[model samples]
Target chain A: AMFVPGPYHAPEDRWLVDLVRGHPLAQLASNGAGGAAPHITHVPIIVDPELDGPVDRLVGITLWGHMNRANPHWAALGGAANVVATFAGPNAYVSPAVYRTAPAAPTWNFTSVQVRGELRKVESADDTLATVRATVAALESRFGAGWDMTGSLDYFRRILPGVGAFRLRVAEADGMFKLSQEQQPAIRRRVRHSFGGAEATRAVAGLMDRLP
Target chain B: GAMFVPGPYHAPEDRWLVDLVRGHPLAQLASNGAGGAAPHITHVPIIVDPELDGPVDRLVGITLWGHMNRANPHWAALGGAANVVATFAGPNAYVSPAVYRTAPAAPTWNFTSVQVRGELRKVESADDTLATVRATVAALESRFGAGWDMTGSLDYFRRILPGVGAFRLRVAEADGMFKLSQEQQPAIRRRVRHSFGGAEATRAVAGLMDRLP
Candidate 1:
């Protein structure tokens, strides 16, 4: 939720959606009760298009995910509570030496978005099933075409009772695009080249190139 | 801090501590706010320094180092918070139910992570800041294969040092969670390994599962 103010602050809505959709694995954090440490969970999430209003705009978007009831964090999800879902995009170390100028210090270039919202449990069985189905479709499509919950519905239904689906209604969205947009053209070029061939680093480089 | 009880899993020894810290240098730092507000989070790469002066084998001392731009809001909020959580997230992947042997199967995430809780101390002196910068460079250069030493140029270091703030987290407690289906049947575990044969995330999970006692 803390970001340096510059070109890195408040990214476009379309870019934020893509970042969350592409990297669905998120780190969710909730407040601790009675001096307890904050509770964190790693879960895969899907942006519910049905809940997002107006396909072209990025307002009132909702997130869908499920958690094992056996996990203690499920207890915290019963009522409405403040939650933060962090989506980390490709990140790489940017050495100071990469800059053409000498006054620059080292930094890490990465893309990340945080959605702060009120999360509540989905109480209806039909709604829970719909959330799970949407999540499965979004995740399994990565393996290629024709991978769905068609043949596995019975197996999925058997385990549905043990899991709880939750939704995070959007309240605030914060993003950081720390991709060296303020650097000189020559320095940005060098930084982009330094990322080289690694997939993650290259993805950072691609983001830097697209900066206006 | 709330890990669901599962078969009392094994935690890596102090030796595995350095391996995990160095291998996964990127960390997510989280701090709880006042009056039940949402926790503030920041992502940064940290250098882990191991100290072996402790009496017990598992009680190895560790210190974490990282710097942020002075303009960031995290610097102002640090002094007010009593404790901070640094999470080092290793490889993680979604394990489909198709890889299970039982009928009542569900999809779960298999991953490795280390959480460090400690009090924060700001490095105010120029000398300590320079040392922290040099150490971070030396550690990161191992992956990039290019060494950039700041100690060689005093004027260059002084010119850029004021723009950033450095802090050291003296690790008071640490815990590792390698959540791979340790509670499931052996046949199911074998199926997981087969499904994760070439994926990077499951490769780390499978390797850790094989090392279990």
Candidate 2:
């Protein structure tokens, strides 16, 4: 629902997928019902690698996550609500003063992806449990420290009723990697140098170096 | 209109909200479209000016100040749209099962977020726009350790003034969620805190958990 022009758009980059996988936290937005404002919930996301089809084709893939049933955001998911899950990656501000080129305007250097899709609430208890377990596995496994839900099945069952799982079928994926791709080589080098070793700055410099 | 339960309740003590705003000045502002259209979002650095006026009963009166490119379509939708939500998010991390006291526990993410709902008000005068720009520069300069004052050069300030549009959000409601295992037992919470102490972002979350009443 936002305008993304040529200089900012990155359609086929695998980095978008890597971003979603690495930064699992997403700001899920949906239409507000009954005169209420739009609803937003900050939830962790786990991309279903099995159901994850080719994103290069732009056909979309599936993502799994859940939220506390107590969150009013879950109520907004009734039926197939049009949802936008925004994944924000490393971002930093770019000062024109640091650029070698004159008359350059200051802008933000950042990377973000918006996954628009149809959100269907997972109804079955077993499916919801599986979704939770899969989400845990995806995040914990990366640390090489294994933590599973098997330790206490009864505790899991008691808490299961309080949460709801969801599956987002990606309909459209849009990305913006605004990292001074349009700047002159000299200006880009200066921009990178000014950022130094800061995490977000380093990430932006890395993307700037790899840009086609 | 999501439900904010007890574990994630909004309290009068608002240092957490202010911390999130100051640390993450860049916010994602979302506006719900008219009719059945989809929502539109804009990313901008906003100033959380506590000096601004609002309900005194609350911790602080929230007046969000930000400017956007005049060419951006988001300008046209604002003011016309009745309400907008500005989300300021801070550090978040996954709480592993190892941190829990018992075997019956499941994994959950601990995050700190502040959502402000307000009416959109456009600041039209050139002076007001300059005020917003000055505030932005002052806040950003402190972090970058370099100051750029546009007010001294009238030619430069006027040349850039028309290119940008300014707006202020008069906050109607503000909600903060510091989901740092407040509901968990002390021993379990301590375990999560110890685990989070290893990382910078998670460490911040761990510190916030300690501040809660």
Candidate 3:
């Protein structure tokens, strides 16, 4: 979202929703005060599963996140920090050799979603615990075996003292799906096929296969 | 590099962490934005200095080279900047508490990442900038590319090198966090690694786990 790409790289709003679901870990960044560097932490965040419209579109959505309170970024959040959370999706380095043309330049084809928002700290321990449980439920159902957390309630409660949970108001969201969409049909196909056999680019190649 | 990394998660060796940077060169470089603007972040290619020997004892004294789009405001503001960090992330996956297979456990994510804080000194000369650009091409092509010869494309590279904002990062500090379930007991950690073997991405986490001392 920071460096805007061409129109060809703009992902569909719905595409971003899928992007967030698959890549929930975001690098949450906040501007620094008093000349310090911007603070950025990688936090696993999820959409408020209950939101009807915003979750469908990405912008104006609600997100749930928690961080270790021991970190200074947590202290900065208490100061009414505004943050931009970036979710990086599958990416690959595009070699110029694949272009099969003169004057080709190398580029990295990647996907990322950035959501900028204001922070709302969840003060009550119950709410923080609730966010934690909901996160478990969301991630378990989507990415894990549906393991019940009934056995871990006390464990979560014990750890709640060190966890700082919060909610994010997704004031704005942008998705950059730079998957060779700017190239011509034949050339783009070459780029896709070049990545077909590479394990590192497995996800990127699949993404390129479905490019519009 | 002052990022808060827990004791159990600190990288045990400089080579292990430096290798991650060398393996994953696409870095997310960020700096605090100006005048209420959103913090400046750019995804750019970075390479460790070729002349550096085996990584040092503490990840200190190494140099990194990178380049961003000249038109990007991030490049213009980087010179002598107080706070510019380039973060490189490795394979990461969600670790469900199910992996614990016992009571008194909560979910956590297993990930590997390296963050570098440095002073950005722009390469002012076009030739030096080209050197950085060419170095990047050679380094990346050897690893992520098909060994495409850039000699014939020198003219094309020259045309774009002007727009490439190349710079050298004098490392102030670098920190690495390889949070691969080191907090779990061996029995439970074994289950976590077993579960990760099912997915391509998580398999990487498992792979790294096996190699960890």
Candidate 4:
């Protein structure tokens, strides 16, 4: 039962991954609509030795990332071919009343992306270590340029014993920015005003203005 | 090694219930230090019953509360339960910074909560505990005051249910007070009053206030 056949395009994939990876904190959608979904879940993975370059290059990095095995979506993935993984960037609840364009029903404008992929279990130690290193590198790079794996070998070795990691090969990615893109500039400005200039909204608004 | 231990006084069946609710959310564990341990809000669940009553009666209720992370230890320990006092949270909404009274001040928070205390009980057995969680979801769904279906994605629900632990308590005592802008000075109160007048937060506040002493 498929509505659309994917491998849609690379442009959408690029935008989606850049949006997710660039945002340090994304609302990882695991449970459902409610906060039952884990907010700050970090999936660490080692890009497959053979697929590393292609994975990283296409922005669909094949590495291990672990979510709470207890998450609802995790169960859905069991023996399943694909599960929708979402990363919701900064978002604010916007009531429909807040939109000055029309006295219409309330709506929430937020930026988020969903990644469709096949998830596989990584039970081997060597594979797990590779995933951990890739994950650690991703995190350390955020701190500053000088930070790298060589500086924190001992710490990683000590903690690696406790955590679990999984491997996910990205198949297709889609991005949606429900910012007031459909509205006129004046109305969009009013919505921004209502949101009190949330940085997330500002980013979307700036993007909207830049588009032809 | 034999060690002196307190007598194992049998707690009522409800004792586990109280403990489960307490440990579920409110009074979550928090630790402070640097490294990766910088003040963060860690969800700490405190199992409580009449036997564990303290001056902070805020821990009363058949409710479970949790903080955002471990960094908010102080807020979780004091501010969260303190604000709730003895009631459960009713409704909350984020107010935009533009609503502030002054231009220089940063965006602040506005929320509502209820303080409730009741008898406690402890539930035994994994089967019973799992049932309790299912019942909680059903009850919450029904309480939404609309004809909403309590349907859930069974696959997902079951996956998480096994991780759901349970405890119970009898309501030997209960107290609750909801503080929205009820204590603020008239001017500040009016500002908040105007800010949330027609918002969902207001509805939540009013609902709890209607139930308050």
Best by TM-score: 3
Please tell me how candidate 2 rates in CAPRI terms.
acceptable
Model 1: lDDT equals 0.71
Candidate 2 interface RMSD to the true structure? 3.2
lDDT by residue (tens digit), candidate 3, A1-212: 36666753554578788888888888988876776667779987988866655456877778999898889889876646678888999999888889998777778888888888788888898789888888888888887766888977988887789988889888888777888887888999999898888777888889888766
Q: Residue by residue across A1-212, what tens digits does model 4's lDDT show? A: 01111221223434555555554332222211221111122232233445432233423566356544543434434443343344444344344345533323223344555555566766666665566666545644542223335544555556555545566566655565656666666777766665555543565555444343
Better of 2 and 4 by lDDT: 2
What would the per-residue lDDT of candidate 1 be over residues A111-196, giving only the tens digit for each residue? 88888888888878888888888887777665322444676778777767877789988787777788887777788899998886
Worst 10-residue lDDT window, candidate 1 chain A:
A49-58
Give the docking tier of candidate 3: medium
Off by over 4 Å in 4: A1-12, A24-63, A67-81, A95-99, A143-148, A189-200, B1-213
Per-residue C-alpha lDDT of model 2 across residues A58-130, encoded as one tens digit per residue: 2366899888787777876787788888888877777666774444345678778888878899889998878
- Give the Å error, residue A82, model 1: 1.1
Instruction: For candidate 4, give the lDDT of residue B153.
Output: 38
Q: Residues B127-177, candidate 1, lDDT per residue (tens digit)? A: 888777767767786664345554555567666788667888877777676
| lDDT: worst 10-residue window of model 2 chain B | B145-154
> Local error of candidate 4 at A194, Å?
6.3
User: Which portions of model 3 miss their true places by more than 4 Å?
Assistant: B53-58, B79-82
Quote each prediction's TM-score.
Answer: 0.85, 0.87, 0.94, 0.40
Model 2, which residues run further than 4 Å from truth? A52-58, A95-97, A100-106, B1-5, B8-12, B50-60, B79-81, B99-102, B144-154
DockQ each candidate and list the results: 0.40, 0.44, 0.62, 0.02
Descending-DockQ candidate ranking:
3, 2, 1, 4
